[PDB]
Amino acid sequence: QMVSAIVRTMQNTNDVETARCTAGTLHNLSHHREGLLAIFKSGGIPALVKMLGSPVDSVLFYAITTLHNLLLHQEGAKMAVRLAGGLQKMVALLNKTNVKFLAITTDCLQILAYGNQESKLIILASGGPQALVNIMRTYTYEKLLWTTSRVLKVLSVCSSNKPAIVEAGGMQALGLHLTDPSQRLVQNCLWTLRNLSDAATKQEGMEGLLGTLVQLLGSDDINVVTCAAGILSNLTCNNYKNKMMVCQVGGIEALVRTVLRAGDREDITEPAICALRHLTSRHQEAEMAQNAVRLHYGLPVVVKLLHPPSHWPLIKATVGLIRNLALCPANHAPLREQGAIPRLVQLLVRAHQDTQRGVRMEEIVEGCTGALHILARDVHNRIVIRGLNTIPLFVQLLYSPIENIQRVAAGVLCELAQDKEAAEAIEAEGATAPLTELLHSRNEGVATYAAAVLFRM
Ligand SMILES: [Cl-]
């Protein structure tokens, strides 16, 4: 009756002092497993949530705290808060300016959003993303940045909240804190950054973030290194401006050092190698990046990654990187001396067999043949490639249902056919027929390569 009276009292008065004292009591009662029941039983949650609209900060503070306590301990308070319209009221409170108050509020949101897609969608509809991002760009209070970064991390895996957080300028905002002395704050920002950076729209003002990510690759903390490598990989995929910036701040050396120190830890090498693959292609300084991998002692370890214990994702990425490295003439000989060709060929042969009987082996087929196509620009490499009895296989790939495989197969044959002895071997393999057909390929690259092979023979 008392608690019930207290709730009603609070939930009715218009005189602010009746609010302070009532809220205070409920608060004080929530310190014990009992009060978390008196309030809950007496329908306090809907009343408290109602007080989240109070004009008296003193009130708001008391209500959000009691709610926080119930949310933390009281079984069944999270669904009750949701039902009462708690989420909308809390997001609306994110425009307040008291950091202790904001820390309690954002923490309630984290507790409610975690493992609950429904709440994540409501936070989004209520404007949660922009409001959380503004907090990261405004305050310095660690407890608040941390709690807010946790709400962002929870929303960052939602296909709907993700693009909204990115649009609100979230990645740049999170980037501001990557050198904060608070490790828990840095790591949460990196985890959120990794989820958001995957397939995000192109952003402006990413310079600082990119420079800091490269520096973090040298960290002794594995989780920091793994995240920095993953973010760099995501942000450089088909983004020539980011590739340029990353290369300009020493990204190639840093990444190579990272792969070297990673050893067989694929959680680090796989993304670092994908980043290197992005940085060694299609941007103004790609050639320079191709040379830089060599110059910083990267060729031997890149080839080594093609061998066990490497798993498929890593091998796929590594093959892709070698393909780009081979575009640089000065890497032709060293890649050959380091043994890239026979391993690429063994991978190709085995991968093809599987297709004739996660990463799809068709991707490895295309990948290796593609790398061989580029390596074949060098005469000594053509001798090695040919000496490994690859021609019969390349010709067989002409019959592939996949156009891209048809393309690199015709392309590597095209390079090989520039040497008369090879042209005869290719013809002896009965490549004329399949090549002829491919002349009418809707895929212009295929058609164009088929024609060049036919000419050379
Ligand atoms: Cl080998």
Residue-range domain boundaries for the chain = 1-456
CATH superfamily of 1-456: Leucine-rich Repeat Variant (1.25.10.10)
Distance 341 CA to ligand 1 centre (A): 7
Q: How far is the CA of 356 from the centre of ligand 1 (A)?
A: 23
Give the residue among 152, 168, 85 at the shortest CA–CA distance from 122: 85
Cα of 304 from ligand 1 centre, angstroms: 9
Identify which of 275, 293, 130 has the alpha carbon closest to the alpha carbon of residue 214: 275
Q: How far is the CA of 260 from the centre of ligand 1 (A)?
A: 20
Structure determination method? X-ray
Residue from 366, 360, 328, 313 nearest 344 by CA: 366
> 3-state DSSP helix/strand/coil percent for the chain, to nearest 5?
75, 0, 25
49 and 67 Cβ atoms separated by less than 8 Å? yes
Map tokens 């087929």 to a residue: 365
Q: Are 268 and 222 in contact (CB under 8 A)?
A: yes
> Cα 322 vs. chain centroid, distance in angstroms?
22
How far, in Å, are 52, 327, 370, 379, 437 from residue 333 at the CA level?
Answer: 70, 12, 18, 10, 35
Query: Resolution reached, in Å?
Result: 2.1
Span from the CA of 346 to the centroid of ligand 1 (angstroms): 8
Cα separation of 288 and 299, whole Å?
15
In the DSSP assignment, the letter for residue 200 is P
Angle at 401 between CA 400 and CA 403, to 5 degrees: 85
Ligand 1 centroid to Cα of residue 343, in Å, is 4
Nearest by Cα to 187 from 149, 236, 239: 149
8 A C-beta contact, residue 144 and residue 135 = yes
Which stretches of 248-295 are assigned E, i.e. beta strand? none
Reduce the DSSP state of residue 15 to 3 states and report it: coil
Measured in Å, residue 292 CA sits from the centre of ligand 1 at 24
